[PDB]
């Protein structure tokens, strides 16, 4: 049904609070962060190039927790 | 020897162009990005908190390249 009859853009359409990132996929040549929305149509693709400006603090933080780390060499 | 006798801060001391981020280390319970400098003392430890504000673009982009997604849950 989507909130409000008036057509609304994609990610960060109005300015709703970011719930939590739960997706990431590289399209033609740019990440497509799957932004989650509490009220809005949860989950939506957004070009990394566009997302970075929307909220770098959010994206940067997402990677921090999702850090696996390779392997420390010290033979 | 360091450029200029006058003491200079750490990362983003004056405002020299950022060559390229080498990586990141969780020092003191906080991720730190080693900013590489072309003219300045190449490589310097900087807290994620300070780095994000200095240049989120380079920061976000760094992970974008060194990114890897896990196996798709759905069988």
């Amino acid at each position: 049904h989507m909130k409000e009859e008036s057509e609304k853009p994609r990610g960060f359409a109005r300015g709703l609070e970011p719930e939590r990132i739960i997706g990431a996929t590289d399209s033609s040549g740019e990440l497509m962060f799957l932004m989650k929305w509490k009220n809005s149509d949860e989950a939506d693709l957004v070009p990394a190039k566009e997302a970075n400006v929307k909220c770098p603090q959010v994206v940067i933080s997402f990677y921090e927790e999702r850090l696996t780390w390779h392997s420390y060499p010290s033979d | 020897h360091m450029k200029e006798e006058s003491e200079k801060p750490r990362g983003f001391a004056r405002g020299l162009e950022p060559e390229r981020i080498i990586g990141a280390t969780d020092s003191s319970g906080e991720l730190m990005f080693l900013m590489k400098w072309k003219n300045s003392d190449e490589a310097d430890l900087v807290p994620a908190k300070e780095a994000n504000v200095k240049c989120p673009q380079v920061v976000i982009s760094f992970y974008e390249e060194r990114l890897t997604w896990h196996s798709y849950p759905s069988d």
């Binding site: 497509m32 390779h70 392997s71 | 080498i22 196996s71």
Partner: peptide, 30 residues
Amino acid sequence: GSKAGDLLFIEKVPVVVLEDILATKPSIAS
């Protein structure tokens, strides 16, 4: 299949790989 082309892709768990900062330092003349 206009702008909203994306419908199905990956839904796993993103992870970043990093080798610290000065973890590796290959050298032969040493």
